[PDB]
Amino acid sequence: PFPWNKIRLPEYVIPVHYDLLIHANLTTLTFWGTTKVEITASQPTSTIILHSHHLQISRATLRKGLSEEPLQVLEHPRQEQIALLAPEPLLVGLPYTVVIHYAGNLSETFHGFYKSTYRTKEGELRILASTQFEPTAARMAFPCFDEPAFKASFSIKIRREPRHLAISNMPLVKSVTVAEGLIEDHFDVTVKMSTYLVAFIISDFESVSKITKSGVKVSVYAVPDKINQADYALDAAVTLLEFYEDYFSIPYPLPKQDLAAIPDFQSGAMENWGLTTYRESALLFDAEKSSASSKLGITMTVAHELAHQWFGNLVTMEWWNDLWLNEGFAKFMEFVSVSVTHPELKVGDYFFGKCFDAMEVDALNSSHPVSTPVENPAQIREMFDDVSYDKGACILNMLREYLSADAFKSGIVQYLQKHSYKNTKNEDLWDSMASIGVDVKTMMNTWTLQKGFPLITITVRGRNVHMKQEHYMKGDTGYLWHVPLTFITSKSDMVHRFLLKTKTDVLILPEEVEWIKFNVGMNGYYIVHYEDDGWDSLTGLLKGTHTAVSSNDRASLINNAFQLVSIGKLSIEKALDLSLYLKHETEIMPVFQGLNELIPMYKLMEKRDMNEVETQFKAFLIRLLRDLIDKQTWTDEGSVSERMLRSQLLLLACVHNYQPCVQRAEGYFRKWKESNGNLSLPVDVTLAVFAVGAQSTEGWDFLYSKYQFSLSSTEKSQIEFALCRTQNKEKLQWLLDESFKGDKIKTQEFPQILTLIGRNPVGYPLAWQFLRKNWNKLVQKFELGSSSIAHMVMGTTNQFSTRTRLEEVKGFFSSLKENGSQLRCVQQTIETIEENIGWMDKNFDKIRVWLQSEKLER
Numbered sequence: 001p002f003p004w005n006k007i008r009l010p011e012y013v014i015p016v017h018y019d020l021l022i023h024a025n026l027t028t029l030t031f032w033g034t035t036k037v038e039i040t041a042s043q044p045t046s047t048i049i050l051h052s053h054h055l056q057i058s059r060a061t062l063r064k065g066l067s068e069e070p071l072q073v074l075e076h077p078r079q080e081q082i083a084l085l086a087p088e089p090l091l092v093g094l095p096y097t098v099v100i101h102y103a104g105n106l107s108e109t110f111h112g113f114y115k116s117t118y119r120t121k122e123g124e125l126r127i128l129a130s131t132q133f134e135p136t137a138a139r140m141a142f143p144c145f146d147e148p149a150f151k152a153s154f155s156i157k158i159r160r161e162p163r164h165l166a167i168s169n170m171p172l173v174k175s176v177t178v179a180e181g182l183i184e185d186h187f188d189v190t191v192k193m194s195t196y197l198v199a200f201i202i203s204d205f206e207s208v209s210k211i212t213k214s215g216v217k218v219s220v221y222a223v224p225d226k227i228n229q230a231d232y233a234l235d236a237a238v239t240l241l242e243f244y245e246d247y248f249s250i251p252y253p254l255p256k257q258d259l260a261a262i263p264d265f266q267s268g269a270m271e272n273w274g275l276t277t278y279r280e281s282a283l284l285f286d287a288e289k290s291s292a293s294s295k296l297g298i299t300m301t302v303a304h305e306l307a308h309q310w311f312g313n314l315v316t317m318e319w320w321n322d323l324w325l326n327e328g329f330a331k332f333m334e335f336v337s338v339s340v341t342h343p344e345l346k347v348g349d350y351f352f353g354k355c356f357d358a359m360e361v362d363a364l365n366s367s368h369p370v371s372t373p374v375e376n377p378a379q380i381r382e383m384f385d386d387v388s389y390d391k392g393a394c395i396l397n398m399l400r401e402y403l404s405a406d407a408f409k410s411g412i413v414q415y416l417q418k419h420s421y422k423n424t425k426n427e428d429l430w431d432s433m434a435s436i437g438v439d440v441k442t443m444m445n446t447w448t449l450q451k452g453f454p455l456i457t458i459t460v461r462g463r464n465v466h467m468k469q470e471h472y473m474k475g476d477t478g479y480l481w482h483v484p485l486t487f488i489t490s491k492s493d494m495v496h497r498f499l500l501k502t503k504t505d506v507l508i509l510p511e512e513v514e515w516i517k518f519n520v521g522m523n524g525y526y527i528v529h530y531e532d533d534g535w536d537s538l539t540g541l542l543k544g545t546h547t548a549v550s551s552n553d554r555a556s557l558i559n560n561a562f563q564l565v566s567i568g569k570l571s572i573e574k575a576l577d578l579s580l581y582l583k584h585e586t587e588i589m590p591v592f593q594g595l596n597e598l599i600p601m602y603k604l605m606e607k608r609d610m611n612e613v614e615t616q617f618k619a620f621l622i623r624l625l626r627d628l629i630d631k632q633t634w635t636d637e638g639s640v641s642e643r644m645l646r647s648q649l650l651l652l653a654c655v656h657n658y659q660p661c662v663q664r665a666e667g668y669f670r671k672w673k674e675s676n677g678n679l680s681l682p683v684d685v686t687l688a689v690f691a692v693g694a695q696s697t698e699g700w701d702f703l704y705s706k707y708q709f710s711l712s713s714t715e716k717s718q719i720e721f722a723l724c725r726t727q728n729k730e731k732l733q734w735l736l737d738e739s740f741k742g743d744k745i746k747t748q749e750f751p752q753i754l755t756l757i758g759r760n761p762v763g764y765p766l767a768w769q770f771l772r773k774n775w776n777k778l779v780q781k782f783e784l785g786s787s788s789i790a791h792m793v794m795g796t797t798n799q800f801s802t803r804t805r806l807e808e809v810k811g812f813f814s815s816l817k818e819n820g821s822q823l824r825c826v827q828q829t830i831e832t833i834e835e836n837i838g839w840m841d842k843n844f845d846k847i848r849v850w851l852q853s854e855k856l857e858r
């Protein structure tokens, strides 16, 4: 019988130091290790439980300090634990070293100690071996006390062949020849840290480097054929690292930081201390072929991972229930940092957007509080979602606006200083912020310990402004938040603030107003509804003088109008009437928000027998933006904002067959193709151009023939997108089969390819079938409940709208039993489908008839 029956490890055996030897064979795909960990026991025990997953342990011994003893090894593969059995008890307070020799196979997934491949520009296959342990995979590389609060120092030794280069968290102290054809690289001992942050990579990478003003050596690593795309990320890393050292008032503790581009990577990037890892697409920039969105993306990702060096590495959450302490803060700092470091990106314009994303999931019963209990690996992995990231960021933005920016800054600095090299709970952050009436802790508990967000309802009767709060949920709570409300009026540009702490309250204006708008700049995780003549007043404002409020305010009105349709407070008709203001809009955020609210309506239709209204609805959309579409140049000119807007509108108009866009596109593609790819296309039109070109066999085959050889993450992305738009079912199967096989398109792309095909009007049946027939191998490759699996579940089902379809979805996921039926994402699609059924049963006919009335304009 295994002597320990909990998922969590015992509390009373604590490691202080690991000494890790790793010898990998990149030709036989095998590895051998020797882990030594120094421990002490606070209670007496002759059993030591630690984590191990898929390692074959050959031998385990216990050292006293001279004296050595063999330990009996027991295995519990479900708990992912081994029991080491001592012949004598451990004496309390005395030091012991546990020594374990074991072996493994390089993982073929994207986690643990795993295999990654690439092609040389001369066509030769190349293997490297990299790591990804967050949250629970460290234990697949080396046996350990694999929970984030057992922090320890690490001394890492990698044995390898001369032709390879090894890198890890810390600098290389020395390289020792241990046998003919075998070198041992010794890395310097780390600072105290969590096991999930250990990293190592064995490759033939090349590097470029730059020294910060503070003496940190920053380096980017990539494969030899792509190292000339590292320059932009290197400049960015230096600037951002310098920024944070100043902002947090705590220098970066390590002598070097490396940023490595991995050719096979499941997430976008990872914060391992001193050795941050990235998808190639999240790190490498090509001056001539990369997009504005990709440049924006590299900067933010680097910003994010370097933020983690303080938030996550230096100060770490005690347990994964409080993961948002790492991920919410990192996501937020992206915006804090990059808006000083790269003001030309104007990233603050886009902050709002994440908040609305979170609200899509958070408005459902299947959401969870920011801070919420989890126990097993799949549960822990599911914390890496939009609540921990995006709501975590949003509520911090909210707290920040509520104290000064300086006060906020002071709190986080005291917090980082006090908890340096340690672990925090949710309550520790609040004690810090509470020590800079004002009660931050009660306030921030409402935002972290209960799910969802409030609807604030505004009633104006003369000078009295009645504010009311209740819990927003799509189909009892009595939940209450402390909401920092902001607002502006027709009489002053000055922003007014009210802390609504109660179900209702009232303020008195010094004079009556033509109009009033709440949640200014959308710095608040809540939505607003206006009673009486309120929305007609706001709709009249956007139709007469839209620039009376900001872009961001316009975007928030659009979103809230449609969110309120979904719970019955506003009619679909009044919201679409508001949409009409977009005829005159010019700014990226409200145009994109409109689209975010309107495209999904035709998406639901596309999956039904509804072609008359689908077509009317799409005509209306293009007509709504037609002026802004016709005003776009087929160039790469302007700000990042202008470019992203350009690229999206051109794609949109061409996908909906607006004939002037299409003919131009056809023409660009013909000349491109007839030069055999030699002509340079403007990057911003290339999506639109490839999408049109891929509608012919000639064009699709041609496009695919360039994918083989491309080195540009953007160009590959653009080709992927275009090929997935084909209406030939045999080609959509191929793409699905191939990316899954991973040889001609890499499997890291499969999730998104599966989603784009699920979005294809004639592809959705194929994508839903493929996910079902291939579930087990996909779960093995990506893990339950990773984001990837989550994105696949929702990407293939969340646009369904019928009961027949709901029963399909329910029946499949139920059959999976212990292998997927408890997944949070499955509950989320189900409730999404359920909301789709009712939204469409109510509004379908209303839209049909509204589209007709809106031609009493002709």
Ligand SMILES: *[C@@H]1O[C@H](CO)[C@@H](O[C@@H]2O[C@H](CO)[C@@H](O)[C@H](O)[C@H]2NC(C)=O)[C@H](O)[C@H]1NC(C)=O
Pocket (backbone or CB within 6 Å): 054, 055, 056, 103, 104, 105
């Ligand atoms: C590494 O992979 C090999 C081969 O895929 C594993 O060895 C096999 O184990 C299976 C299943 O128990 C046996 O039926 C086979 O006969 C084995 N093949 C060989 C060549 O030994 C091996 O277990 C893996 N290592 C670890 C730790 O899991």
Ligand SMILES: *[C@@H]1O[C@H](CO)[C@@H](O[C@@H]2O[C@H](CO)[C@@H](O)[C@H](O)[C@H]2NC(C)=O)[C@H](O)[C@H]1NC(C)=O
Pocket (backbone or CB within 6 Å): 024, 025, 026, 027, 028, 159, 160, 161, 180, 181
């Ligand atoms: C990994 O395993 C290979 C295959 O056994 C090792 O093989 C060396 O390389 C070639 C390929 O077979 C042989 O001709 C050599 O003679 C083998 N070793 C030597 C010293 O000559 C390879 O060295 C191993 N790599 C690691 C890192 O352990």
Ligand SMILES: CC(C)C[C@H](NC(=O)[C@@H](O)[C@H](N)Cc1ccccc1)C(=O)O
Pocket (backbone or CB within 6 Å): 134, 135, 267, 268, 269, 270, 271, 300, 301, 304, 305, 308, 327, 330, 331, 384, 389
């Ligand atoms: C939010 C993005 C800008 C980048 C993001 N990376 C991170 O959050 C890292 O800080 C995470 N700590 C890495 C991670 C992601 C998924 C599973 C395990 C581990 C990612 O999506 O990978």
Ligand SMILES: *[C@@H]1O[C@H](CO)[C@@H](O)[C@H](O)[C@H]1NC(C)=O
Pocket (backbone or CB within 6 Å): 365, 366, 475
């Ligand atoms: C909301 O959540 C809980 C947990 O799954 C459940 O008991 C309850 O049925 C849910 N409410 C509705 C309307 O489904």
Ligand SMILES: [K+]
Pocket (backbone or CB within 6 Å): 245, 246, 247, 248, 249
């Ligand atoms: K400073």
Ligand SMILES: [K+]
Pocket (backbone or CB within 6 Å): 368, 374, 379, 382, 383, 824
């Ligand atoms: K969960």
Ligand SMILES: [Zn+2]
Pocket (backbone or CB within 6 Å): 304, 308, 326, 327, 330, 331
């Ligand atoms: Zn992160």
